[PDB]
PDB file of C-alpha atoms and ligand atoms in Angstrom:
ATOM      1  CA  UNK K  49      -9.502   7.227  -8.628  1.00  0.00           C
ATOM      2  CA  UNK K  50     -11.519   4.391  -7.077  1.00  0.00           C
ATOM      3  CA  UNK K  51     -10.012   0.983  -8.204  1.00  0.00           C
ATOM      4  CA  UNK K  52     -12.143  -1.605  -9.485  1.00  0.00           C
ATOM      5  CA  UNK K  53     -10.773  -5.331  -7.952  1.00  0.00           C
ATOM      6  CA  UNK K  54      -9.605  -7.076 -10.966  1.00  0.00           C
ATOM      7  CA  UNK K  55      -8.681  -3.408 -12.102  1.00  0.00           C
ATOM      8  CA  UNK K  56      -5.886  -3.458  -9.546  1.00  0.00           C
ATOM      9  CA  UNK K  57      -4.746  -6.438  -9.994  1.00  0.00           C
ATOM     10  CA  UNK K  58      -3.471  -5.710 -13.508  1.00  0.00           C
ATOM     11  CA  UNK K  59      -1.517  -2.556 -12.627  1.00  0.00           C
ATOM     12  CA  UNK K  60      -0.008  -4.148  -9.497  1.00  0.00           C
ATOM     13  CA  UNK K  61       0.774  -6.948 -11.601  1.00  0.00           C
ATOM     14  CA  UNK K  62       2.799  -4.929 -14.159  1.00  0.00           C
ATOM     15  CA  UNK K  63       4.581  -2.671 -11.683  1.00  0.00           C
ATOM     16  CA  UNK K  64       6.293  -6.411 -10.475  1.00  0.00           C
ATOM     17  CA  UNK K  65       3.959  -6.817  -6.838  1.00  0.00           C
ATOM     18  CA  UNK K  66       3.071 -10.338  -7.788  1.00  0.00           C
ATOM     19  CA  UNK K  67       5.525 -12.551  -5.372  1.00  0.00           C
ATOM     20  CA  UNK K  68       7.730  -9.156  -4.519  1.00  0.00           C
ATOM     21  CA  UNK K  69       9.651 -10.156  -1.588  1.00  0.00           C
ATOM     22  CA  UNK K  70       7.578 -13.806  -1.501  1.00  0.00           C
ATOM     23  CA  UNK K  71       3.860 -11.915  -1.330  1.00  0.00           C
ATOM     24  CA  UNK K  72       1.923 -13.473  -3.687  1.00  0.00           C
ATOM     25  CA  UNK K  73      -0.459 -11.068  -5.671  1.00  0.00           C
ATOM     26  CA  UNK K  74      -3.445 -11.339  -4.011  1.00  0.00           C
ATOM     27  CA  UNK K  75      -1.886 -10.055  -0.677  1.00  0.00           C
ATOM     28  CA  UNK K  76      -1.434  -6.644  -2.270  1.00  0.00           C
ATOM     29  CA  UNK K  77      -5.106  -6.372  -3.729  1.00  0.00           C
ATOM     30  CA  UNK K  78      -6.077  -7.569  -0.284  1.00  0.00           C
ATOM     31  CA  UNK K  79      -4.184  -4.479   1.883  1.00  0.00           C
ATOM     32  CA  UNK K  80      -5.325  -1.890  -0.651  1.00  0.00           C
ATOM     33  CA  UNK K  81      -9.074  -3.265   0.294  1.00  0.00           C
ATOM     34  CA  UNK K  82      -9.262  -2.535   3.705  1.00  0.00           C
ATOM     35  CA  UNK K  83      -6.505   0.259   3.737  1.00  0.00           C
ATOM     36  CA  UNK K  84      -7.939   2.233   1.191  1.00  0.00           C
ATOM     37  CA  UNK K  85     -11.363   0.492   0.016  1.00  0.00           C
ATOM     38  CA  UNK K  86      -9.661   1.000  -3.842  1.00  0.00           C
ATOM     39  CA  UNK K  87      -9.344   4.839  -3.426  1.00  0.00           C
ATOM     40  CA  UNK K  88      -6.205   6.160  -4.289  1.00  0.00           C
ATOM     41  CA  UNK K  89      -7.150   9.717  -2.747  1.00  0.00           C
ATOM     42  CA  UNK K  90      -7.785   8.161   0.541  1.00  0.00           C
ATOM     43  CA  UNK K  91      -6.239   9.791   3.544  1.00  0.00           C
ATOM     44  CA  UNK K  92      -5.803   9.264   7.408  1.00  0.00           C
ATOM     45  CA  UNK K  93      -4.562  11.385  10.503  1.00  0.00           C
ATOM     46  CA  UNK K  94      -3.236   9.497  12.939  1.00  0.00           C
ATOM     47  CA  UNK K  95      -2.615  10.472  16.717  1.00  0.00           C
ATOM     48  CA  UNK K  96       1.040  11.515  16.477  1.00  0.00           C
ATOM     49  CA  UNK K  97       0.636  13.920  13.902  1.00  0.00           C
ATOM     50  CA  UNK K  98       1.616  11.802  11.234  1.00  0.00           C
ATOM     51  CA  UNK K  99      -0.644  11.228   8.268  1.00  0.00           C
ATOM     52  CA  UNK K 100      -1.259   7.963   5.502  1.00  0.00           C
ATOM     53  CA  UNK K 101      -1.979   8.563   2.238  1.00  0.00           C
ATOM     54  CA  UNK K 102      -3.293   6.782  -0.868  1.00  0.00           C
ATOM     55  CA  UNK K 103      -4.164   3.458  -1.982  1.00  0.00           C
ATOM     56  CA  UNK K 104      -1.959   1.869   0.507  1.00  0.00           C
ATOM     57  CA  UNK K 105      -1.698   4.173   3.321  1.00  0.00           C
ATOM     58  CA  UNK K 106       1.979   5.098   3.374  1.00  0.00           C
ATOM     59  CA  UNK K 107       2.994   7.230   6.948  1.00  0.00           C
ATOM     60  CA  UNK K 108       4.260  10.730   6.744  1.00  0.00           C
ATOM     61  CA  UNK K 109       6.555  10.068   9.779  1.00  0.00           C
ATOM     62  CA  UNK K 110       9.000   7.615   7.924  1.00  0.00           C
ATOM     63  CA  UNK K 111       8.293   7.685   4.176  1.00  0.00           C
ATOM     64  CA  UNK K 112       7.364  10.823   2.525  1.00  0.00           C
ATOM     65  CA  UNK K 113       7.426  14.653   3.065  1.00  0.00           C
ATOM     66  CA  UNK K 114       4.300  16.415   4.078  1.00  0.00           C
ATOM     67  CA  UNK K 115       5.584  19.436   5.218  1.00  0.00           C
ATOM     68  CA  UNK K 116       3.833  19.307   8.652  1.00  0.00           C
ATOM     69  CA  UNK K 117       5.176  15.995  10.665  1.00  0.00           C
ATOM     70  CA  UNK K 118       7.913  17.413  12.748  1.00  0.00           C
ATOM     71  CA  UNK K 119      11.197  15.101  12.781  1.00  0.00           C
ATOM     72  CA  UNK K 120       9.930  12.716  10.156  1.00  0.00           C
ATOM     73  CA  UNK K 121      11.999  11.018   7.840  1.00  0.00           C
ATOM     74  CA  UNK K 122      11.273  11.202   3.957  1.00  0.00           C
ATOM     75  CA  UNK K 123      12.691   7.648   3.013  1.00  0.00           C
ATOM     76  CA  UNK K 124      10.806   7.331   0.089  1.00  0.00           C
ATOM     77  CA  UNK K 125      12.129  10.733  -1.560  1.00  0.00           C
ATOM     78  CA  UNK K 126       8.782  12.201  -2.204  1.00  0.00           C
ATOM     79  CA  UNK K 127       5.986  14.415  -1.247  1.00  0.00           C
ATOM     80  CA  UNK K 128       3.259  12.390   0.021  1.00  0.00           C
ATOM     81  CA  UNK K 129       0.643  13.976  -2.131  1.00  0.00           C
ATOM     82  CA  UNK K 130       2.122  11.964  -5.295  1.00  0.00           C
ATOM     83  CA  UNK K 131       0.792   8.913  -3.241  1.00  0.00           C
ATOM     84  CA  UNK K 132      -2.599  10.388  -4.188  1.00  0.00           C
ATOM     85  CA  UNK K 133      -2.248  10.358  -7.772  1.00  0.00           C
ATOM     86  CA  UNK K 134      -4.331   8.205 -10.229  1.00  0.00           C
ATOM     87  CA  UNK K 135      -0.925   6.232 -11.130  1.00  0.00           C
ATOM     88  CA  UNK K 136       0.058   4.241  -8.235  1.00  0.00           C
ATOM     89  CA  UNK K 137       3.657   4.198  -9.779  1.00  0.00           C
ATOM     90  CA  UNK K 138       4.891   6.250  -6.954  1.00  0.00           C
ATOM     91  CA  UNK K 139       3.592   4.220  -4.063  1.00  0.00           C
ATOM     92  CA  UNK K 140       3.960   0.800  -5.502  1.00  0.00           C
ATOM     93  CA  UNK K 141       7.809   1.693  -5.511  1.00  0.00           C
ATOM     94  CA  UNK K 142       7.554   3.124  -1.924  1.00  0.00           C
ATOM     95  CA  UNK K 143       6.057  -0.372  -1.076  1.00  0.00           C
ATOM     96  CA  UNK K 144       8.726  -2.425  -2.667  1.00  0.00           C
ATOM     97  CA  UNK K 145      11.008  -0.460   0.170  1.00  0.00           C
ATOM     98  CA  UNK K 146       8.660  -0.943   2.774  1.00  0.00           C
ATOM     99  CA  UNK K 147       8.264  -4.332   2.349  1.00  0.00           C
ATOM    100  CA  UNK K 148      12.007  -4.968   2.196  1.00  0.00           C
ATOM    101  CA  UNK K 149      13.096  -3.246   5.613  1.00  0.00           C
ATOM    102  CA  UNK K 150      12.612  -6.088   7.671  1.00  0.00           C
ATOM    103  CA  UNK K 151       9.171  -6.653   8.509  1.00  0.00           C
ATOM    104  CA  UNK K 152       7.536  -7.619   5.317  1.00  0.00           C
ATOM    105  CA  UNK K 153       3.710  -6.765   5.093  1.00  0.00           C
ATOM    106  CA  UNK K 154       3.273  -6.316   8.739  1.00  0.00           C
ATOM    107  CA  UNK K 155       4.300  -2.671   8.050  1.00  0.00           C
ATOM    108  CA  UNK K 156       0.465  -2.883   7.204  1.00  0.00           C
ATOM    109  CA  UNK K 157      -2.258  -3.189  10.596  1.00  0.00           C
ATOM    110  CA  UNK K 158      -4.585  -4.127   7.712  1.00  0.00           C
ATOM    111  CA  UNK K 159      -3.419  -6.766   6.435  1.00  0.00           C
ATOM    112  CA  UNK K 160      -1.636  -8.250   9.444  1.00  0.00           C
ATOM    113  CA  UNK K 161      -5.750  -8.244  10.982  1.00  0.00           C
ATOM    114  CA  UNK K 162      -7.348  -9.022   8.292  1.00  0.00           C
ATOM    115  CA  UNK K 163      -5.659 -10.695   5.155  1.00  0.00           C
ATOM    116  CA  UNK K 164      -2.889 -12.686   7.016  1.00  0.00           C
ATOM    117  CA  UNK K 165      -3.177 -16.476   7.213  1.00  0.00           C
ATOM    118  CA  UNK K 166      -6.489 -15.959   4.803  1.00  0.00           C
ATOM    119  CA  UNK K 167      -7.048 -17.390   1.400  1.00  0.00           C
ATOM    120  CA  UNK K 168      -6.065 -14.411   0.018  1.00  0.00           C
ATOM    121  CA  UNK K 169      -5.894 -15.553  -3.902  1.00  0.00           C
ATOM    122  CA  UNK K 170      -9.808 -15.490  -3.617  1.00  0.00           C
ATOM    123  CA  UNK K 171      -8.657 -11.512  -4.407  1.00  0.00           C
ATOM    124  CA  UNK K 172      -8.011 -12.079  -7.785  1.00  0.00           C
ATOM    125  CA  UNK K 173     -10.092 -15.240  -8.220  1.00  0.00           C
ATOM    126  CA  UNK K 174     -12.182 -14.197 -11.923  1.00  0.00           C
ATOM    127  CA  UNK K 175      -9.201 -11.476 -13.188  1.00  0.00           C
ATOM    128  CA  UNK K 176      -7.735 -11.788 -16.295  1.00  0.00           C
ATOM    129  CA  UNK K 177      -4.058 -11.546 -15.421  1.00  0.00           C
TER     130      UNK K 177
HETATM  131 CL1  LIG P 490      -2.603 -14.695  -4.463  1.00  0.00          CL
HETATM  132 CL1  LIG P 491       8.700 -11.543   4.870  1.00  0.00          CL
HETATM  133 NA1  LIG P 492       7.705 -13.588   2.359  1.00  0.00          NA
HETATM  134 NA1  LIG P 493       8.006  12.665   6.659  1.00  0.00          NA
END
């Protein structure tokens, strides 16, 4: 599923993303722009083997099973293809951890390049939230 803007917003709004952690909403909408461009079935194979997947590019070699990244760790508890699905229930909830383990949103490259220290509530400037 391809994501409109304001589309986002809503669901990441209802699964509790809005100020998770001190992130305001518009942080969120902005990472799933330039991570994913909206698309939940979005992936990525990066150098080591690893692989992100979905709507916020979560990495096979710490958060979910794949079945083919050699002495990863699942913490997550999932198979990264339900990162792909057209509910973003399962990787919102991965996020929430993500976000929590130390490092906040620079877990992200996206966002720390291009989202941090913006105005980022221009993401969900004209949404009816
Ligand atoms: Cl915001
Ligand atoms: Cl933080
Ligand atoms: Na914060
Ligand atoms: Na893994």
């Amino acid at each position: 599923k391809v994501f409109g803007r304001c589309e986002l917003a809503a669901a990441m709004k209802r699964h509790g993303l809005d100020n998770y952690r001190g992130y305001s909403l518009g942080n969120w909408v902005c990472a799933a722009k330039f991570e994913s461009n909206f698309n939940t079935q979005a992936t990525n194979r990066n150098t080591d083997g690893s692989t992100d997947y979905g709507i916020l590019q979560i990495n096979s070699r710490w958060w979910c099973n794949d079945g083919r990244t050699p002495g990863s760790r699942n913490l997550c508890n999932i198979p990264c293809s339900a990162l792909l699905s057209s509910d973003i229930t399962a990787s919102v909830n991965c996020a929430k951890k993500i976000v929590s383990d130390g490092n906040g949103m620079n877990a992200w490259v996206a966002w720390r390049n291009r989202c941090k220290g913006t105005d980022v509530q221009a993401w969900i400037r004209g949404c009816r939230l």
